[PDB]
C-alpha cells in the first residue's frame, strides 16, 4: 500500500505517534516519506546482509527477524514479514521501541538527513486530522 501524505498523518495520529516520546507527528510522516516514500511494502537489502522493511524501513539485524540476517537480535520480538502489511500497527509498535532508545529517531538515517532540523510540522499541515 502507498499512503497519501495526509492519509498517513491521520493513521499515525490514530496510532499514537503525535508527541510520542518528544517527537511531534510531522517527524514520523517526514520519516516515512524519505525512508520508504510512504510504501508499506518497501524493502532494501543492505550490504551487511540485513534488510530494512516497511514504511519505516525497520532493520532485520537489530529489530525484526527475517531468518536470513547474521547477528540478528530481534529487539522488537517480531518477524519482519509483519512489518510489510498495509496495516501499520506492527511497524508503529516496533518504531516506538526503537525511538525509546537514547538515539531516538536518529536510528532512521533518511529522517536524520532529510527531516531533522527542518520544519517537520509542514508534513501534517493542509490535512484533515
Amino acid at each position, epitope marked *: 500500500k502507498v499512503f497519501g501524505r495526509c492519509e498517513l498523518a491521520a493513521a499515525m495520529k490514530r496510532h*499514537g505517534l503525535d508527541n510520542y516520546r518528544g517527537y511531534s507527528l510531522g517527524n514520523w510522516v517526514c520519516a516515512a516519506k524519505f525512508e520508504s516514500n510512504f510504501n508499506t511494502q518497501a524493502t532494501n537489502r543492505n550490504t551487511d546482509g540485513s534488510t530494512d522493511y516497511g514504511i519505516l524501513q525497520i532493520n532485520s539485524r537489530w529489530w525484526c527477524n527475517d531468518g536470513r540476517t547474521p547477528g540478528s*537480535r530481534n529487539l522488537c520480538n517480531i518477524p519482519c514479514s509483519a512489518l510489510l502489511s498495509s496495516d501499520i500497527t506492527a511497524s508503529v509498535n516496533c518504531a*516506538k521501541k526503537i525511538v525509546s*532508545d*537514547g538515539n531516538g529517531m536518529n536510528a532512521w538515517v533518511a529522517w536524520r538527513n532529510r527531516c531533522k532540523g527542518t520544519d517537520v510540522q509542514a508534513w501534517i499541515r493542509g490535512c484533515r486530522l
Partner: antibody
Amino acid sequence: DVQLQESGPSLVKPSQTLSLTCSVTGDSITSDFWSWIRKFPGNRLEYMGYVSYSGSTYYNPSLKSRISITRDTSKNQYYLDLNSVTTEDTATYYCANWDGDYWGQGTLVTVSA
Amino acid sequence: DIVLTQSPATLSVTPGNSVSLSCRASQSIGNNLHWYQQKSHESPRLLIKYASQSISGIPSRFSGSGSGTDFTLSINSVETEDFGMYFCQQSNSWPYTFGGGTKLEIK
C-alpha cells in the same frame, strides 16, 4: 523461553546503597531493553527506569538521581543500585523487560534501622 | 509527569457479570496506555497494550478501548480468576507512570 529472577538482600539500613540483581535465562540481555519497577505498601507502582540496547538509560526523576541501572553480558544479568535509601524505599522490587511480557517474581526489600 | 487516575478505586462483582474499569490521563497520550493485572504476592501481567491491542495468552474476555485522555478496560463475564488489582500505565512520555489501580473483588 525467557525467565527473569531478582536476587539480593531483603533487609537494608537507612543511608546505604540498595543493590538488586536480575538474572535472565533463555536469551541474551543484548536482545532487549530492561527495566526495574517497584510497588510501595499501598498498591502504588512506580516505574524506576530502564536501560536500552545502546546502553542509554532513562531514570524516573522521582528517584532524584540516586539510581543506576547497569548490565553484565558475560553473566547475562542487569542490576539496580539505589543510593542513600530511606524507609520510603521499602517496597517490592521487580525486574521486567521493556515490553512487559516477562517479569521476575518480585522481591521485598525493607529499609529499617 | 502525566498523571493517570483510575476509577472506581474498588469494584465488587458477581462472577458472570461484566465490568468496565476507567483510566483517565492528565494530558493526551494517544493510544499509549497499557493495562496490567496483579494478584496478591504475584508480579504484574500485561493484559492489553496500546489501548486496544490484544496479547497472546490472555483471555478473550479482556478488551480495551479509548484514546487521548479517556481509556477503559472491559471484562466480558468476570471469572473467579479475574479478581485482583488492575493498573493502567502510559508510555507516551518519560517517566512512564501508573494509575492508582482498581481492585476487582467478588461482591
